[PDB]
Amino acid sequence: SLKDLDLNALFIGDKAENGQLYKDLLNKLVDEHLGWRKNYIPSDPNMIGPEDQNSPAFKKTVGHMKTVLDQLSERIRTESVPWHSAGRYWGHMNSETLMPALLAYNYAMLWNGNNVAYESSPATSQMEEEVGQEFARLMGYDYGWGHIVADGSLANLEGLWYARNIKSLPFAMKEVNPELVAGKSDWELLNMPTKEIMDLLENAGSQIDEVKKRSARSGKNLQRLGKWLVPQTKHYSWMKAADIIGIGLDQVVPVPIDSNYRMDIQALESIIRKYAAEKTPILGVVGVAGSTEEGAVDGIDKIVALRQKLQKEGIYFYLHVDAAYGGYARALFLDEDDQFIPYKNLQKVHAENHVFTEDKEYIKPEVYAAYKAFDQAESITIDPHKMGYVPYSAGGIVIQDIRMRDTISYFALLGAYILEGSKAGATAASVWAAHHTLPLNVTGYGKLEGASIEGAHRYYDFLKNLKFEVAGKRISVHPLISPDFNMVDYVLKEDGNDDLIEMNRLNHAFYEQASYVKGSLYGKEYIVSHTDFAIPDYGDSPLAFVESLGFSEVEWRHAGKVTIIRASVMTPYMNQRENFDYFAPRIKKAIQADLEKVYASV
Amino acid sequence: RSLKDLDLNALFIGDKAENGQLYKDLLNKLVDEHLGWRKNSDPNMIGPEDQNSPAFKKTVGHMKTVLDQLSERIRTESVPWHSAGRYWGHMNSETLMPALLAYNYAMLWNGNNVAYESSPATSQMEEEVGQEFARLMGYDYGWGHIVADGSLANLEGLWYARNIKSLPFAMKEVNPELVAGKSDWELLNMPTKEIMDLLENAGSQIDEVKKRSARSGKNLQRLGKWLVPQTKHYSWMKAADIIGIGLDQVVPVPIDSNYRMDIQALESIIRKYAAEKTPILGVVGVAGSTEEGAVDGIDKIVALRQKLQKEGIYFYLHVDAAYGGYARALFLDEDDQFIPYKNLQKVHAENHVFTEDKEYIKPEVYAAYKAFDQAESITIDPHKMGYVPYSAGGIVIQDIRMRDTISYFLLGAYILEGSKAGATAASVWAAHHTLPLNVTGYGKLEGASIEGAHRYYDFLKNLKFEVAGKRISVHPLISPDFNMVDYVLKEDGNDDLIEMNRLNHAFYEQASYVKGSLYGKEYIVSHTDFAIPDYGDSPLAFVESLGFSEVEWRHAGKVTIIRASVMTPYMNQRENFDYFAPRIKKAIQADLEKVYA
Ligand SMILES: [Mg+2]
């Protein structure tokens, strides 16, 4: 059952180890396409002949095209920022995509079908429908749907469009046919569960188009529809979506995050109750699976339980899960029949399917619990071009109930149901090929997501007790938290130095040493990324951490931030002990050397 | 240097993959260059012992099985490839070879153009593409970028208009002296340039001003009506829905018998709203309409705006040139300067844009394109008439300062979408650098398309058929503004419009493929209905000219139209078209015989 699937065979390789394989398969596919143009329908005629191809103007034009491509080729290689290789690159980026996804794009692009125009793309249109079904099955939706989006931010925007329109439907039904919602107060109309709204819409029958005309689509009083509650670290990104969708940026309300950088569910409830008390509705809540700088996974199960509790008090909220980064990781929890694996059996199933090379606990109970609850969310974002290992650009959205698409649809198949317009069939081919090489369960993506998580854990373990002596100073590595997923963060700190401004200065100077300045010829032996956790975006979420290092709350406010060394361990190659242990002493040496340069330059 | 003998035949794989080996040779060179770049003392994580292990070989075989399934679907669940001379429908899938090759190569890096660090070369390429767009459109101080598609480019244009309309009031809220003495009506009719100048004068206050703009969600419907040609009414309802003004704020403007926006109607509509003190959020003019290839009189709209400004009325102008945008290259000389009308045929002959020295471009089309530089924003799609592979749309803005009105905190800060592939920028860049956006490059390609359309149009206006005792005529719709050509077949003297609609639908079914078709057809067409809700009475003059009554028009509610968008480059040559002409005629005869059988 794909038991001994070997991930090394599914990538070009950091050193182009499988380059010839890629080239061979690429040429086979291109040959298939060229043969199809030539022979699929004999006649023709050929519009271009040898007499044309051997003319001087033709040959000149080929030379001109070569000059353009050679220029393009040179610019990309000259400006490029040396290829990241496993063991040396421990930063936030990844440029290693699945070979079948690459090949499928290359091949399908030759037909250049547009997936909104079926006639140009019958094959890739069907592939995108299957991808939608595969997303729905991955998320445990029994009657859901999904599609590929131009990118992940547009997928989130589409989720908000869904929430906005759905929230407005009971009022739209009241205006078109009061009998549909007779005996319900306006507050009750604004707190109707989504499935009930959808049932009512379907029940409007002949009147559905008229109801849609009176919904948020009409633009009437969008701020009546309530507040959009998001983790504080996502507040800025959601302001843009709220701005675009017309509810306005003040309708986005930040919810504090905790010391795990997950949404604080006690705070979530307090905020909801505050608005409910003044009869301000909640348009929706966003839970994050795989935060941008910490890989944190919000307690989706706790949010769902909270909603169930509040419904007894007449409060409902739409739930959107942003699993842009963490979506494919749900494949860890589905067996070969796509059934959700009970927690007590997870390590057993993972060993049987060689998901992890060592039998240990990698997935936290609270992470498992969050993933289990995804099937309760109205919508979920999941991006193939993040942890799906599909080339940019490919985002994704999944909806709980296929009927939801009727709330945003425009008529006169696929094009009627989406926010965007024209879209490449090649993208659908690319995602489809990835999904069919690696099924969305433990037999396929479970292994790939597993390899990444295992690499993260090895790196975390390596950092945990790391100590250095530089110019007579003891310097310690302090990992931020044990990873919920595959992102690992840490700070370097001079022992006994309790000046937080100085620690930030250290980690900033360290990052600059362990990174490239453009025009860089030499590849380094250790590259990292970085970010700041600043009060305006993080609140006091990092306070317990900085206090654990010996800093005071007074010190925390004086600095107003903490600088963090960042890794997103997306490479699949660091799961093997042999592979990581080879690099461990070399990383240690690189860090020692970088720290020396830092201290030397003062 | 001037690319005088640039040969379009060398720039495509070809309908029969005539240039297939060239594509492969160039592709392999590029792939080799990337692979060698990755290879530039560490051990390899994928060793030779790994690659020769049984599990590795088994996995490779698994991958090959998947790609074989992919291949079967795409090859066999397909509509046959378009064959020039036989295919006269509304679509095109052929792409410029350098655009394909550039994408193939760049995507190997998997750069993301919102993260410059991830993609410095392709980020520069997208900036250059934006500048190239601005130059094509005559915008001395403008900018642009690639968008996922044209519908999103239109949405972004509306986002701009919406935010910009709201800025005068926003400025009043933050600093009344910026707009002292200005009534609310004056605030709602400030020309965009004045708004941008004031916003620049606001200096560091810009961020607080933006908080009080339409970004706040407040007073969206106060911003006024969005006026679009009737044939775009439905598509703009979706954009207005998304952006929060609401579909109720979209107002259809009647189109004329040339399927161009009626500018007298536009003026009547604007004056009526302005007399009520309802502002106009904006007007959309279309260059290259969806089913007729019509070009609105952008120049007439610009002149109307100037007239109305004297009376305290302003409107934002967005030009939707998704289809017709690259055709502006017909009007730019080798130094990208607009060609005087009297010199157009001379310059076109000097540069082999057209195969004959005669008139091809209507004066009113020339005039419309010349006025583009007065529009606040313009949509243009590389994946339509730029021959770049999907997905690649585009937007151009008149004044770079406009991007400050929609920005969030380079490139990612200034756009509606998020992540965008560096490969997409490479693909557009390679097309633009192979074919400059003037008569030396795209002029030739857009010209070849227009000329094919003209030959087809001339051929259609002399066609009669004797079939099953009946006499059938072809009636072309209108002379093309661009490269779209439409017609109807009709039984002579038959005044039943429902019957004519029946005939044209049945003809289309004979002259089209289905998924899985294998028998080659000598003639393929597309079709659409011009129905009253989208067209109003614009086709009434046409149907009356054929003998149908106005009563008959209302009875049927629509007219069925046989559709062609001549995007092939090969029908510009007389020798080529004249070969297929007798064949098309015989195919129409045969298809009609089947219809009437
Ligand atoms: Mg000028």
Author numbering:
A (entry chain A): 7 to 418, 431 to 620
B (entry chain B): 6 to 45, 49 to 417, 431 to 618
Which lines from the publication concern this structure?
Tyrosine decarboxylase (TDC, EC 4.1.1.25) is classified into Group II and shares high identity with L-3,4-dihydroxy-L-phenylalanine (DOPA) decarboxylase (DDC), glutamic acid decarboxylase (GAD), and histidine decarboxylase (HDC). TDC could catalyze the decarboxylation of L-tyrosine and L-DOPA to tyramine and dopamine. LbTDC is a homodimer, and the two subunits exist in an asymmetric form. Similar to the structures of other Group II decarboxylases, each LbTDC monomer is composed of three distinct domains: the N-terminal (residues 7–105) domain, the PLP-binding (residues 106–462) domain, and the small (residues 463–618) domain.
After optimization of the crystallization conditions, the crystals of LbTDC alone and in complex with PLP (apo-LbTDC and holo-LbTDC, respectively) were obtained and the corresponding three-dimensional structures were resolved. Compared with the open conformation of the apo form of the human DDC structure, the structure of apo-LbTDC is in a closed conformation. A comparison of the structure of apo-LbTDC with the structure of holo-LbTDC revealed that there are two opposite conformations of K240 and H241. In the apo-LbTDC structure, the imidazole ring of H241 is anchored by two water molecules and is distant from the PLP binding pocket, and the side chain of K240 is placed in a position near the PLP binding pocket. Residues K240 and H241 form a short flexible loop. Additionally, through a structural alignment with drDDC and pig DDC, a conserved histidine (H192) was also identified, which has been reported to interact with the pyridine ring of PLP. This interesting dynamic change in conformation suggests that K240 and H241 play important roles in establishing the conformation required for the binding and stabilization of cofactor and substrate.
